[PDB]
């Protein structure tokens, strides 16, 4: 804060008016100029095909299995359930040490499941064991804030985002700390690993998201296009874009190579915030779980609502499309999971 | 249906049976959230302790009081997890009038919360032992930091102690009626009816919520 703050505060801004100028220079189109002639997806409708009941408290997270069949639901009752979407069977019911859990993830191999909440610890569970039950494999402590999103990189490394303004990557075998991604100025809420699993994005409560290099360790770029907290994030299937779901009643998407905001996806009649987002199979449909007990389906190219997913009497907190894009697994605070089409 | 599928269905049925069994136990107890300031001494508010949670039962009904710790001074996102508790215990000590302004601003922020619009608060004014010895001498009065702390009704100690309660009830009834109501009490370090006051407040809270749920209020 010395003479290098009447100097290096402007020089901390010189690279902001010379970045927005660089940013606003490479913009010869908006999304709705080359996606105007494409006919709309129509009034996309989707009825519920399987209602996975059984939870008591409100649902906070839900992750799809890689096999497009199993899924794991996290609720504030201290229970973790692995489902069989085809038959609505309950494969497992894993009790939790901490009754407050806000994260859940499925390992890509299907051998593990992670959870974490206000305990500031990611507990990773072993599904397939010779013992015949589900027991903790590791107790990933060393993080101060409450966990907000866990995602499995491989069978041995996991990426977590917490409320202490730090995204941060572990190694399950050692349980120690490999890389700590810092730079956010607020509670990080969401996480979305890239399909190539060499980068990821995270949205905090500072109206900004940062694309991190998981291999290297530093933020490649920061994306500021909102005005409130970002409590939802999801990655485009092609790996070159992603969407931000914020609580300011709008959900923007960004392009990694363009380093800009493409569309807003906002409606005047919608006032409630967004909780979760996901692209279905090709990025044309952007599922978005809102706060007014609904989940709009957005034609991403046209920025028009294609359908609604009403059927939850409480706010929708979970939203996830399956690997083959055959169904959705929206879950809400009414302790009810639902599968659509 | 295959035999293996039949056995899987039976295993699932057992899973739901065991899950439902725990629901009765979860619903029997009552959930409380403890919060306040660092100097409030929230831990010694409940002198019988028996996320730092405690499990105390008075009149043979169990309460689980959760003291959130380690989190920063935001409470913006992890407070959107407790909108099912019976009440929130906001403990503030009145040992210093320099921080009572910050305390009442914090109470205004937490009372006028979108996710906490239908949940009530029980106000515990901790550390009433030294309020007398801070007002009996009068070497530093509340009117130094406030405009009109010059009228309220030892007599002097009580007239000094009811002004903060007047301010807090003014804040509470400023916005939000019926759904949630503050419960201003007076707690000491050596006071013994702290859990009793909590119980006597939450029974009335449950009564009010049942009145609204039967549509009688």
């Amino acid at each position: 804060l010395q003479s290098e703050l009447d100097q290096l505060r402007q020089e901390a801004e010189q690279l902001k008016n010379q970045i927005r100028d660089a940013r606003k220079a490479c913009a010869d189109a908006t999304l709705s100029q080359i996606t105007n002639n494409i006919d709309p997806v129509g009034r996309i409708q989707m009825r519920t095909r399987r209602t996975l009941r059984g939870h008591l408290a409100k649902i906070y997270a839900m992750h799809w299995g890689t096999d497009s069949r199993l899924l794991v639901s996290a609720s504030q009752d201290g229970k973790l359930i692995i489902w069989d979407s085809y038959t609505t069977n309950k494969v497992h019911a894993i009790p939790l040490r901490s009754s407050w859990v806000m994260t859940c993830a499925y390992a890509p191999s299907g051998n593990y499941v992670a959870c974490g909440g206000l305990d500031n610890i990611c507990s990773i569970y072993n599904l397939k064991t010779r013992e015949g039950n589900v027991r903790v494999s590791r107790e990933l402590a060393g993080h101060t804030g409450y966990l907000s999103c866990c995602r499995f990189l491989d069978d041995n490394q996991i990426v977590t985002s917490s409320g202490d303004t730090t995204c941060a990557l572990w190694d399950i075998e050692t349980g120690q700390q490999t890389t700590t991604f810092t730079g956010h100025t607020g509670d990080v809420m969401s996480l979305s690993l890239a399909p190539d699993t060499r980068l990821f994005v995270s949205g905090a409560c500072d109206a900004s998201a940062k694309l991190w290099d998981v291999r290297e360790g530093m933020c490649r770029q920061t994306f500021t296009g909102h005005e409130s907290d970002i409590n939802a994030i999801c990655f485009f299937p092609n790996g070159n874009a992603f969407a931000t779901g914020s609580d300011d009643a709008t959900c923007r998407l960004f392009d990694l190579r363009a380093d800009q905001e493409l569309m807003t996806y906002s409606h005047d009649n919608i006032i409630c915030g967004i909780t979760s987002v996901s692209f279905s199979k090709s990025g044309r449909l952007l599922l978005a779980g809102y706060d007014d007990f609904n989940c709009n389906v957005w034609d991403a190219l046209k920025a028009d609502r294609a359908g609604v997913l009403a059927g939850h009497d409480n706010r929708v907190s979970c939203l996830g499309v399956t690997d083959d894009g055959m169904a959705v697994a929206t879950g809400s605070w009414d302790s009810f999971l639902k599968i659509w089409n | 249906v295959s035999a293996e599928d039949k056995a899987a269905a039976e295993r699932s049925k057992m899973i739901d049976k065991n899950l439902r069994e725990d629901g009765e136990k979860a619903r029997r107890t009552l959930r409380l959230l403890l919060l306040g300031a660092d100097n409030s001494g929230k831990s010694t508010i409940v002198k019988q302790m028996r996320i730092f949670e405690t499990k105390f039962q008075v009149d043979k009904v169990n309460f689980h009081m959760f003291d959130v710790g380690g989190q920063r001074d935001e409470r913006r996102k992890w407070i959107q997890c407790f909108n099912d508790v019976t009440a929130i215990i906001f403990v503030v000590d009145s040992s210093d009038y320099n921080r009572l302004q910050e305390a009442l601003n914090d109470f205004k922020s937490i009372w006028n919360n979108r996710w906490l619009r239908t949940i009530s608060v029980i106000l515990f004014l901790n550390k009433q032992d030294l309020l007398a010895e801070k007002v009996l001498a009068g070497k530093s009065k509340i009117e130094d930091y406030f405009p009109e702390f010059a009228r309220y009704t030892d007599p002097r100690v009580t007239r000094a102690k009811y002004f903060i309660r007047k301010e807090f009830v003014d804040i509470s009834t400023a916005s939000g009626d019926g759904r949630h109501i503050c419960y201003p009490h007076f707690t000491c370090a050596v006071d013994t009816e702290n859990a009793r006051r909590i119980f006597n407040d939450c029974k009335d809270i449950i009564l009010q919520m049942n009145l609204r749920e039967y549509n009688l209020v």
Epitope: V91 | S2, K6, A7, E10, R11
Partner: single-chain antibody, 229 residues
Framework: VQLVESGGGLVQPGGSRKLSCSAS????????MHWVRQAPEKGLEWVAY????????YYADTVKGRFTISRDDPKNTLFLQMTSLRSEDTAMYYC??????????????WGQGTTLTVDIVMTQATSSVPVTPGESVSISCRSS???????????LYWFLQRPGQSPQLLIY???NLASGVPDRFSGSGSGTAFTLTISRLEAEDVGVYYC?????????FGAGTKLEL
Amino acid sequence: VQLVESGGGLVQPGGSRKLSCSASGFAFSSFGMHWVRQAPEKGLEWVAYISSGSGTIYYADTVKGRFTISRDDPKNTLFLQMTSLRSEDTAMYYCVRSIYYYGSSPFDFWGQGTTLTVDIVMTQATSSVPVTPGESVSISCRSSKSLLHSNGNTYLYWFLQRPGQSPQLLIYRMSNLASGVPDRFSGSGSGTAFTLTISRLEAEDVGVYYCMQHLEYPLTFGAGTKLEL
């Protein structure tokens, strides 16, 4: 994980015998236990079944009413009551653990069997093949009905029985593999006829394999395909 049972011996016909299994080292209450008999030199014949908890009991036809199955969860104990010791009762009985959820591997673990002396037909036409070590083998089994169920998985199980060893799981539910089983093992086939094509077999593979179905709960056993030289 360690399963054991005791109560063998010699029985004068017309008597009762309490055969009990002492499970240890796993979540007993979350496993559907079984019982599988084997005559001294004939082949395995599944006899009974108990589900997780105290659900369905699925005695075999040849012993229905004559044998009773019981379990004691909190002490981790399993039983097999026997009445009226018969001429064909002389066999070695095994207790095999299995769990049924999506992706689980039933019949994964077996206990060392105790000897107590006195209808989908599945045939393994070859009961003895001298297979040169190091090259390959193509053990085959066939059924009478199509094991391909509507959900898309055939319910054939393969096992291995070395001399002086309890049966061990092998490629199960057509082309799936169990834990502790080398990747060289493989097997595929259609309904009504299956194969066990192995790649680069080595020593410690000589034994009598078995082919059992799991579509209808009477679980018939194949003749066996024991190898040699």
